[PDB]
Design an enzyme around this catalytic site. Structure first.
Site, PDB file in Angstrom:
ATOM      1  N   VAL A 125      16.929  16.727   9.080  1.00 48.90           N
ATOM      2  CA  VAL A 125      18.277  17.276   9.228  1.00 48.90           C
ATOM      3  C   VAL A 125      19.301  16.322   8.618  1.00 48.90           C
ATOM      4  O   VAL A 125      19.224  15.118   8.907  1.00 48.90           O
ATOM      5  CB  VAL A 125      18.603  17.557  10.711  1.00 48.90           C
ATOM      6  CG1 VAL A 125      19.999  18.158  10.854  1.00 48.90           C
ATOM      7  CG2 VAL A 125      17.567  18.475  11.352  1.00 48.90           C
ATOM      8  N   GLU A 178      23.629   9.638   6.246  1.00 53.76           N
ATOM      9  CA  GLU A 178      22.617   9.289   5.262  1.00 53.76           C
ATOM     10  C   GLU A 178      23.197   8.775   3.953  1.00 53.76           C
ATOM     11  O   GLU A 178      24.273   9.135   3.509  1.00 53.76           O
ATOM     12  CB  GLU A 178      21.771  10.522   4.925  1.00 53.76           C
ATOM     13  CG  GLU A 178      20.973  11.087   6.072  1.00 53.76           C
ATOM     14  CD  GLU A 178      21.665  12.114   6.944  1.00 53.76           C
ATOM     15  OE1 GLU A 178      22.874  12.298   6.802  1.00 53.76           O
ATOM     16  OE2 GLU A 178      20.957  12.726   7.789  1.00 53.76           O
ATOM     17  N   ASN A 217      17.124  11.907  12.284  1.00 55.75           N
ATOM     18  CA  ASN A 217      16.258  13.055  12.043  1.00 55.75           C
ATOM     19  C   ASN A 217      16.013  13.164  10.547  1.00 55.75           C
ATOM     20  O   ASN A 217      16.937  13.410   9.768  1.00 55.75           O
ATOM     21  CB  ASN A 217      16.901  14.336  12.606  1.00 55.75           C
ATOM     22  CG  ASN A 217      15.899  15.470  12.550  1.00 55.75           C
ATOM     23  OD1 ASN A 217      15.211  15.643  11.548  1.00 55.75           O
ATOM     24  ND2 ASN A 217      15.817  16.169  13.669  1.00 55.75           N
ATOM     25  N   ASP A 257       1.047   1.544  19.904  1.00 56.24           N
ATOM     26  CA  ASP A 257       0.727   0.998  18.586  1.00 56.24           C
ATOM     27  C   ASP A 257       1.550   1.713  17.528  1.00 56.24           C
ATOM     28  O   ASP A 257       2.130   2.776  17.781  1.00 56.24           O
ATOM     29  CB  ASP A 257      -0.764   1.190  18.329  1.00 56.24           C
ATOM     30  CG  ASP A 257      -1.383   0.517  17.130  1.00 56.24           C
ATOM     31  OD1 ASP A 257      -0.727  -0.315  16.463  1.00 56.24           O
ATOM     32  OD2 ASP A 257      -2.569   0.853  16.884  1.00 56.24           O
ATOM     33  N   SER A 258       1.612   1.153  16.321  1.00 62.26           N
ATOM     34  CA  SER A 258       2.132   1.916  15.186  1.00 62.26           C
ATOM     35  C   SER A 258       1.010   2.821  14.674  1.00 62.26           C
ATOM     36  O   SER A 258      -0.113   2.730  15.169  1.00 62.26           O
ATOM     37  CB  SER A 258       2.612   1.034  14.062  1.00 62.26           C
ATOM     38  OG  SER A 258       1.719  -0.021  13.774  1.00 62.26           O
ATOM     39  N   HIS A 265       0.817  -1.222   0.000  1.00 67.51           N
ATOM     40  CA  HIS A 265       0.000   0.000   0.000  1.00 67.51           C
ATOM     41  C   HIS A 265       0.847   1.266   0.000  1.00 67.51           C
ATOM     42  O   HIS A 265       0.278   2.352  -0.155  1.00 67.51           O
ATOM     43  CB  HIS A 265      -1.012  -0.019   1.139  1.00 67.51           C
ATOM     44  CG  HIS A 265      -0.596   0.418   2.501  1.00 67.51           C
ATOM     45  ND1 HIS A 265      -0.179  -0.453   3.484  1.00 67.51           N
ATOM     46  CD2 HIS A 265      -0.551   1.645   3.064  1.00 67.51           C
ATOM     47  CE1 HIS A 265       0.105   0.230   4.581  1.00 67.51           C
ATOM     48  NE2 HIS A 265      -0.111   1.520   4.358  1.00 67.51           N
ATOM     49  N   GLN A 271      -0.307   5.995  11.330  1.00 69.18           N
ATOM     50  CA  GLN A 271      -0.089   6.561  10.000  1.00 69.18           C
ATOM     51  C   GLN A 271       1.314   7.135   9.869  1.00 69.18           C
ATOM     52  O   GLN A 271       1.842   7.812  10.755  1.00 69.18           O
ATOM     53  CB  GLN A 271      -1.149   7.619   9.675  1.00 69.18           C
ATOM     54  CG  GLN A 271      -1.004   8.968  10.345  1.00 69.18           C
ATOM     55  CD  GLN A 271      -1.995   9.999   9.824  1.00 69.18           C
ATOM     56  OE1 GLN A 271      -2.637   9.822   8.792  1.00 69.18           O
ATOM     57  NE2 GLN A 271      -2.146  11.099  10.561  1.00 69.18           N
ATOM     58  N   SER A 282       3.695   2.964   8.188  1.00 70.77           N
ATOM     59  CA  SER A 282       3.418   1.929   7.192  1.00 70.77           C
ATOM     60  C   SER A 282       4.635   1.535   6.375  1.00 70.77           C
ATOM     61  O   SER A 282       5.448   2.345   5.990  1.00 70.77           O
ATOM     62  CB  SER A 282       2.322   2.368   6.216  1.00 70.77           C
ATOM     63  OG  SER A 282       1.082   2.425   6.924  1.00 70.77           O
ATOM     64  N   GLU A 321      19.099   7.139   8.302  1.00 74.86           N
ATOM     65  CA  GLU A 321      18.434   8.293   8.891  1.00 74.86           C
ATOM     66  C   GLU A 321      18.163   8.172  10.387  1.00 74.86           C
ATOM     67  O   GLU A 321      17.817   7.124  10.924  1.00 74.86           O
ATOM     68  CB  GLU A 321      17.051   8.465   8.244  1.00 74.86           C
ATOM     69  CG  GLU A 321      17.049   9.021   6.842  1.00 74.86           C
ATOM     70  CD  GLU A 321      17.337  10.501   6.772  1.00 74.86           C
ATOM     71  OE1 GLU A 321      17.823  11.061   7.776  1.00 74.86           O
ATOM     72  OE2 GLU A 321      17.078  11.058   5.689  1.00 74.86           O
TER      73      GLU A 321
HETATM   74  N1  TL4 Z   1      -8.265  -5.478   5.811  1.00 70.88           N
HETATM   75  C1  TL4 Z   1      -8.883  -4.421   6.274  1.00 70.88           C
HETATM   76  N2  TL4 Z   1     -10.075  -4.624   6.944  1.00 70.88           N
HETATM   77  C2  TL4 Z   1      -8.265  -3.013   6.040  1.00 70.88           C
HETATM   78  C3  TL4 Z   1      -7.605  -2.792   4.764  1.00 70.88           C
HETATM   79  C4  TL4 Z   1      -7.145  -1.476   4.465  1.00 70.88           C
HETATM   80  C5  TL4 Z   1      -7.197  -0.286   5.385  1.00 70.88           C
HETATM   81  O1  TL4 Z   1      -6.708   1.126   5.286  1.00 70.88           O
HETATM   82  C6  TL4 Z   1      -7.193   2.311   6.203  1.00 70.88           C
HETATM   83  C7  TL4 Z   1      -6.716   3.570   5.371  1.00 70.88           C
HETATM   84  O2  TL4 Z   1      -5.328   3.656   5.753  1.00 70.88           O
HETATM   85  C8  TL4 Z   1      -5.450   3.500   7.180  1.00 70.88           C
HETATM   86  C9  TL4 Z   1      -6.296   2.257   7.447  1.00 70.88           C
HETATM   87  O3  TL4 Z   1      -5.367   1.197   7.611  1.00 70.88           O
HETATM   88  C10 TL4 Z   1      -4.048   1.671   7.251  1.00 70.88           C
HETATM   89  C11 TL4 Z   1      -4.048   3.141   7.816  1.00 70.88           C
HETATM   90  O4  TL4 Z   1      -4.002   3.386   9.313  1.00 70.88           O
HETATM   91  C12 TL4 Z   1      -2.829   2.778   9.899  1.00 70.88           C
HETATM   92  C13 TL4 Z   1      -1.538   2.655   9.202  1.00 70.88           C
HETATM   93  C14 TL4 Z   1      -0.417   2.016   9.886  1.00 70.88           C
HETATM   94  C15 TL4 Z   1      -0.575   1.489  11.219  1.00 70.88           C
HETATM   95  C16 TL4 Z   1      -1.854   1.578  11.922  1.00 70.88           C
HETATM   96  C17 TL4 Z   1      -2.043   1.025  13.319  1.00 70.88           C
HETATM   97  N3  TL4 Z   1      -2.940   1.579  14.105  1.00 70.88           N
HETATM   98  N4  TL4 Z   1      -1.287  -0.041  13.731  1.00 70.88           N
HETATM   99  C18 TL4 Z   1      -2.991   2.235  11.255  1.00 70.88           C
HETATM  100  C19 TL4 Z   1      -7.885  -0.571   6.653  1.00 70.88           C
HETATM  101  C20 TL4 Z   1      -8.418  -1.892   6.953  1.00 70.88           C
HETATM  102 CA    CA Z   2      18.771  12.991   8.375  1.00 77.67          CA
END
Ligand code: TL4
Ligand code: CA
Length: 223
Positions: free
Chosen positions: A57, A62, A54, A171-172, A40, A174, A177, A52
């Site tokens: 900067v 790098e 920062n 959690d991770s 994605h 946006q 990814s 990397e």
């Molecule tokens: N298979 C599905 N049902 C599913 C499939 C796709 C999808 O995408 C929505 C749109 O992008 C959003 C969101 O997902 C990616 C992103 O949010 C994130 C990205 C990275 C980490 C985290 C996290 N909280 N660990 C969240 C959402 C759901």
């Molecule tokens: Ca840097």
């Protein structure tokens, strides 16, 4: 990364930033010529940024290298994010050193409860928005598939696993990814998706890399 800590410069030497004028996704260096990320995160015109800390900067370790090709998994489904994995080739080989290093592919899948390291330059806020400029880290365990499936009924395939804390807080998020989930020295996961970030009962969902080791090895040998 929500609820994590500052990793420390270059302490996660396989972590790469994908840049198209700006950071947009994480990735993992797996040898001097190839990066693993999430499908994605695909787009044309990628520059891989290695060594990397920062990302706003130039700190002197790098390496910026353009992608010569990207290969999205042949079965990636953009709706469900099933098979959310891609390979990126570097136009020229990276110079491997203590700050620019590859991460090993798994020999087998990890088991539930295993502790992992997740890292990235993504949002650090569970509500609202704050992007760090330095790399952030999080220790989190692989959750059982039943707990995963329970939180996300009908949405989890055999190519996904959940990791994190059901209570929330960590959690991770946006911007993380494509980045690594490393357990016992091996790349077991790719930051893929989730519901919000660090929300209760909504753990992060990660691409299960161990199912793709044959495809990775065969693809890089043929490209
Ligand atoms: N298979 C599905 N049902 C599913 C499939 C796709 C999808 O995408 C929505 C749109 O992008 C959003 C969101 O997902 C990616 C992103 O949010 C994130 C990205 C990275 C980490 C985290 C996290 N909280 N660990 C969240 C959402 C759901
Ligand atoms: Ca840097």
């Amino acid at each position: 990364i929500v609820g994590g800590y500052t990793c420390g410069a270059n302490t996660v030497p396989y972590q790469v930033s994908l840049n198209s004028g700006y950071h947009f996704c994480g990735g993992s260096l797996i040898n001097s010529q190839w990066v693993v990320s999430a499908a994605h995160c695909y787009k044309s015109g990628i520059q891989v940024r290695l060594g990397e800390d920062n990302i706003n900067v130039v700190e002197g370790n790098e390496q910026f290298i353009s992608a010569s090709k990207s290969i999205v998994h042949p079965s990636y489904n953009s709706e469900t994010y099933n098979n959310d994995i891609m390979l990126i080739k570097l136009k020229s080989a990276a110079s491997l050193n203590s700050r620019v290093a590859s991460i090993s592919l798994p020999t087998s899948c990890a088991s539930a409860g295993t502790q992992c390291l997740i890292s990235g330059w993504g949002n650090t806020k569970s509500s609202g928005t704050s992007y760090p400029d330095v790399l952030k880290c999080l220790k989190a365990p692989i959750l059982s598939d039943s707990s995963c499936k329970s939180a996300y009924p009908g949405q989890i395939t055999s190519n996904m696993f959940c990791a994190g804390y059901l209570e929330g807080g960590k959690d991770s998020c946006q911007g993380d990814s494509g980045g690594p989930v490393v357990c016992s020295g091996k790349l077991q996961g790719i930051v893929s998706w989730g519901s919000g970030c660090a929300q209760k009962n909504k753990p992060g969902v990660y691409t299960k890399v161990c199912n793709y080791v044959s495809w990775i090895k065969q693809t890089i040998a043929s490209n």
